[PDB]
Each structure stands twice: as C-alpha cells, then as structure tokens.
Design an enzyme around this catalytic site. Structure first.
Site, PDB file in Angstrom:
ATOM      1  N   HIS B 243      11.559 -40.042  -5.449  1.00 43.98           N
ATOM      2  CA  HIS B 243      10.162 -39.676  -5.641  1.00 43.98           C
ATOM      3  C   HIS B 243       9.560 -39.115  -4.357  1.00 43.98           C
ATOM      4  O   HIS B 243       9.973 -39.458  -3.239  1.00 43.98           O
ATOM      5  CB  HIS B 243       9.355 -40.891  -6.127  1.00 43.98           C
ATOM      6  CG  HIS B 243       9.301 -42.025  -5.145  1.00 43.98           C
ATOM      7  ND1 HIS B 243       8.577 -41.968  -3.974  1.00 43.98           N
ATOM      8  CD2 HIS B 243       9.856 -43.261  -5.181  1.00 43.98           C
ATOM      9  CE1 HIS B 243       8.708 -43.109  -3.320  1.00 43.98           C
ATOM     10  NE2 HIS B 243       9.482 -43.909  -4.032  1.00 43.98           N
ATOM     11  N   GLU B 296      15.302 -39.313   5.295  1.00 43.07           N
ATOM     12  CA  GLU B 296      16.425 -40.155   5.684  1.00 43.07           C
ATOM     13  C   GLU B 296      17.760 -39.522   5.340  1.00 43.07           C
ATOM     14  O   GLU B 296      18.771 -39.887   5.943  1.00 43.07           O
ATOM     15  CB  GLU B 296      16.290 -41.540   5.031  1.00 43.07           C
ATOM     16  CG  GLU B 296      15.117 -42.376   5.621  1.00 43.07           C
ATOM     17  CD  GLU B 296      13.771 -42.086   4.965  1.00 43.07           C
ATOM     18  OE1 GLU B 296      13.740 -41.314   3.980  1.00 43.07           O
ATOM     19  OE2 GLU B 296      12.745 -42.608   5.461  1.00 43.07           O
TER      20      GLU B 296
END
Lengths: 365, 364
Positions: B243, B296
């Site tokens: 998301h 990330e």
C-alpha cells in the site's frame, strides 16, 4: 491540544488500579496495605501482578557474574539486561507464546535484581558465594545477601516493604516505555532495558527524594520547623513534598512510614517531625495549594535504613518496578497492537539548501 | 476506544515534514531529493536535523574499541551506548544546558556508528588502525573504512545516499521511545539506548526489505514477471511492495533507485525489472488498491550494493536514524514536558489476599 499526552488514555488494563480519587492502590484487586501488612514477599507480589494470582513465585536467580562494570548501578543493569537475549536465546515477543514470554520475564527480572546487588557490592570485593545466598528463603533475602553478605534481617524486611509498595503504579514513563518497546514485538530483555533507561530520569516520579541532607540537619539541630523555614526562606525547594498525587495521603507513603516505624528505623523520629513541619509550613504559605508527602520522602528513609546509598536508590526503585513492567509487557503482548502516536510539522515551508544558515560550510561530493 | 494512541497527536515538531499528501519529505524545510542529489553528507544532514542549520557537522568518532560482543549487533550498540554515560560524565538532560546536550548527542551518535562498524567487522578480524580512518574526509567514509578496511568510494556514496534518506521520518516507535525517555530528564545515552531497543522489534517497520532471494532468482531464471507471479501463486507475499505511503512514489525510493543507477549497482537492471513486474502484477490483481514500491526495496538494493550483508541491514537503518533520534531528543529537551499518558482500569475490584487463587501456597 496540550503537548505530552497528559491524561490521554492509551490502554485499558487489568493489572492494577492506582485509585487516586479513592486514595487507594490495588494490585489485581488486592490492596497494597494488606500485602505489606501481611508480609507478602516481593517475589509473590511479582507473580500476583504478572499472572493475576499467587501461583508461581519469582524463581531465584541463576549464578551469573555481572559482565558490565560501568560505575553506575542503573547503567550496569540496563546494559546487562539487554545482553541476556543472545546468550539466553530470547526471541522477539512476536515469535513466542505467552508461557515462554512469562518464563523469560521472570528469569530476567530476578537477574536484574542479581545484577543490581553485584553492581552495588562492586568490583573491589569478592563475590558472595552462591551457597550462602542459597540459604535464603526469599528472592528479597537473596538479593540482600548477594549484595551485603550478612544483611540485617530487618533491612531485608524494609526492602520487601519498599519493593512491594513500588512494584506497580499505572502508566508512568518507564512502564509506558516497556509497553511501547514490547508493542514492536521486540524481545522482553530489550523492553526491560529500555524501561530502565526511562526510570533513570530524575523527572520520572517516584525516584527517592534527596532528603538525607535535610534529615541530618534536624538531627544535629533539633528544631524541625526552624530547619524547614530555613530552606524556604532561602528559596530552596522542600524535598519530598508537593502537589497531591492521591486524593489525600499516598497509600504507599503511609505503608512505608508504617514500615520504618515497625522496624525501629533510627531516623523515624526525625522524619516524622520533618513530615509534620514541612506539611504545616508549606500548607500555611500557600493555603490554596494541596500539599502532601511524596512517597519519595519515606522511600529515602526506608532505603537508607536498609543501607542503600543515595546513588543506588534509582536502581532499587527499578528493582521493585520490574514486577509492574513485566506485568504490562505480558499484557501488551496479548494486546498485539503497535503503539503509534503521530506528530505534525509546524514551521517554515519549503526552502532550498542554499538558503540555510551555514550552507557555505558544506562540502558536496 | 482504540488502544495504542493510533492517530493521536503527541507532539508538534519543527524537525521534519513527511508531507505524504504532497509526495515530498523535507528536513527543516529542505527537500530530501535536493539533499541526496547534491550529495550532502550524512554528518551534515545530522547537523541540519538536530540544529536546524548547517555548519557544525557531526564530528569523527574518538578511538574506542567496542566493549560488548554479545553475538547481536543491535544488543552490542544498545548496551554500549548506555555505558557511555558514566565514562564520559553524561549528566541527566535535566541538569545540563542545550548546547551541552547537543554536544553529548553528537559524540554518542557518532560512537554508535563506530560501534556498528566494529561489531559488524567482528572479533575475528583485527581492527582497522585509526590512522587509516583518519585519512577519510567524511563520517560516512570513516564508518566504511573502520568496517571494511579499504571500502569502494562508490559504496561510500551509496551509504551516504541511504543514510540521508533514512535519517528522519516523523513519529515511529523508536523515535517515540527516545522522546519518552528524554522527557524524564534522563541522560541522552539512556534515551538513545532505549530507542535501539524499540527499533529492534519486527513491527517497528522501516527495515530494509528481504528481497535478495527474489532478486537472486530473477538473476538466474531471467524473467521478472514469471517469478513475481510464482511467488504470489505459492501464497507468499511480494517483498518490498505494498500500500502507498506517500501519495504516489515515496521520494526516498526515487532517490535510492537513482543512486543505484548512478553508481552502477550490478543488481540495478534486475531490480528495476522486478519493480515494474511486481507493480504491474500486484496492481493488475487488485485494481482497487494503491500499490507503490516500498523505499525499503531499494534500501536493500543500495545496501547490498555497498557489501552490507542481510543480517547487517537493520543495523545500517539504525545508523541512519540516529540523526532523527538525536534531533527529537534535543527537541524534547527544549519542550520540557514529561510524557504521561494514562490507562483505564478494567480488572478485579477490591478483594482480600486470602481470596486470591494460590494464597495457600504463599508463606508468611
């Protein structure tokens, strides 16, 4: 809004109830005045808070010479507890069941006590042999033997009263830190280590007050009221007294006073005279202010009676509070919700790096 | 009632703006894409965040062999930092002035970096001599020298892009822990140490994504779109994608992708192929869901590029975030307000000791 989450409800809890409006403090429904009066030992109150019943007392500490010698008792136990996870195999809370978490908490809490006692005894003394500590009937007696060798048996009683009175008190900063860290799913030693960091702050509340200088003056002067007025007339703050915490008397302060009286603490007379002189003095000077004895005042008396030095009193507070921390860590585990407050940026909008003060000193690749 | 302060406003801040609706991240008003693209070094971004201006960059670490060798790099630094307070004479925040607190933050923050480079290098290697570290011109270079001995300049550039992109990101559990501890008036090493404890939990978030296996298969199998469909068909989760965090692209993901391209990262081509394949496949399977690349994902790429092993990437994320932690500790010092939330009791009412299960086991 007001900065600081002051009075903002972060959790519900079944662990204990500081009923401040009712002037009482209960652990799992049990009043602390009963526990201290009926001599329930700290290791049993630990189980009461963590489990909800007296089913599995705190076990004794295994032998483990303290690896950290930093010159600060709090630092030794904060660092040394974090270090337990790799050697003892503590996995993140996320990865273990409740029984495992509860076993790890008990094993690390009592080792926190062991570490404090060894750090207090210090590196310039040989350690107390485990066989002498093994003759002891309670964790509290073991702690005091590991530290002092041959503790006075009333000094053990004093500490058992203090620790049970200090075991838990709702959502203070160190208990909050414990739950925040645990809410990340971190291992329990990491959450206890971080709690010790918060407990070390002089603004934490409950840290034993610096009343020994005052109590030595009244001992050598006799005029309690004269000493109290000397401190205020010079503008210095009165130590151990201030705004109310409970509706009237802090029940913890009552039982610690009843303990120092109980045990025949030699300072009990001066401390009583100072409590009444300081309360009457402060109340007169500000009749619009609620003034009560901070539990920290009688904590310093009971701790000093048991031979705890001033720079060890935060570590002794930590020791007692391990019970509540562990209780809240376990409850937070079952809650399974990450703590996630927010913050809003309030300030200047976008600007170039070259517009920032001192940009000329920056060297770019 | 919703436990856990979810959505509750705890602080105002002047440090940084994760402008998620605006798709931009700013440190003290300065866009991170300007900082990273202009190659501003981490030690200067440290000073920007903490001080609000440049000039007093983060200083080099003094020589100090790490005293903790626990088997866990996170533990070594959490313990090692707390022990800095007695040997260095760190007094509680309540008893020192701001500039003294800033100095202490700087000295300990760079020691955290030193300890991570040492703890990573490990006890089975000799230490790199301080004279070789002293030939470096930036703290980030000094870190990579202390750890690797002769680091590749491009790898220093990669870490500098990463650390700056990771320095600060608003309230999270470790930043919150640092402020809570600092709010008690504790010394700054105790606040940094507890922050490390919170950073260590798997749910803190922000750690480099575990994408090396997937990137390894696409490097061998050769077809990105095939592997990503496999992984979702086997019921597993696509690592590094989910998301949206910002309105669209996370600006930190963009600048790290660009650094990996610019520095010539060998995995760059497969990673880009994996990003497009994963984004198409995830979005095509759920058109009603916003999907973007987690920063990330590229964090792992950039860190793997700089020869950081997977087991040492959480520690690298901690190193970068020390800048945000110190800024918030200093801001909390200036706020001067104990953090003091509350709880509602919903447990047993008053009862006698003897009424509690197991009272018979208790001994007087």
């Amino acid at each position: 809004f007001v900065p600081g989450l002051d009075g903002v409800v972060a959790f519900t809890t079944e662990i204990a109830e500081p009923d401040k409006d009712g002037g009482a403090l209960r652990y799992r429904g049990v009043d602390i005045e009963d526990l201290v009066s009926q001599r329930v030992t700290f290791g049993d109150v630990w189980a009461l808070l963590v489990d909800g019943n007296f089913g599995s007392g705190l076990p004794p500490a295994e032998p483990f010479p303290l690896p950290i010698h930093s010159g600060d008792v709090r630092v030794d136990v904060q660092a040394g507890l974090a270090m337990l996870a790799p050697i003892w195999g503590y996995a993140p809370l996320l990865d273990i069941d409740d029984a495992t978490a509860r076993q790890q908490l008990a094993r690390a809490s009592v080792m926190a006590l062991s570490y404090v006692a060894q750090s207090a005894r210090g590196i310039y003394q040989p350690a107390v042999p485990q066989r002498i500590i093994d003759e002891c009937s309670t964790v509290t007696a073991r702690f005091m033997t590991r530290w002092q060798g041959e503790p006075d048996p009333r000094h053990i009683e004093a500490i058992d009263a203090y620790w049970v009175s200090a075991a838990e008190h709702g959502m203070n900063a160190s208990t909050f830190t414990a739950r925040v860290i645990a809410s990340t799913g971190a291992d329990v030693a990491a959450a206890l280590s971080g709690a010790i960091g918060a407990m070390s702050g002089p603004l934490h509340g409950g840290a034993p007050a610096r009343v020994l200088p005052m109590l030595d003056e009244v001992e050598r002067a006799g005029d309690a009221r004269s000493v109290v007025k000397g401190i205020l007339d010079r503008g210095e703050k009165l130590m151990g007294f201030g705004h109310r915490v409970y509706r009237a008397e802090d029940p913890r302060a009552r039982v610690l006073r009843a303990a120092a009286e109980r045990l025949g603490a030699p300072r009990y007379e001066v401390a009583v005279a100072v409590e009444q002189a300081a309360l009457s003095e402060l109340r007169e000077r500000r009749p619009d202010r609620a003034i009560e004895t901070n539990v920290e005042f009688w904590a310093a008396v009971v701790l000093d009676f048991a031979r705890v030095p001033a720079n060890m009193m935060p570590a002794m507070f930590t020791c007692g509070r391990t019970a509540g921390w562990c209780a809240h860590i376990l409850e937070q585990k079952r809650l399974g919700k990450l703590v996630r407050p927010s913050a809003i940026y309030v300030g200047p909008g976008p600007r170039s790096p070259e517009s920032v003060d001192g940009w000329e000193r920056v060297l770019t690749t």
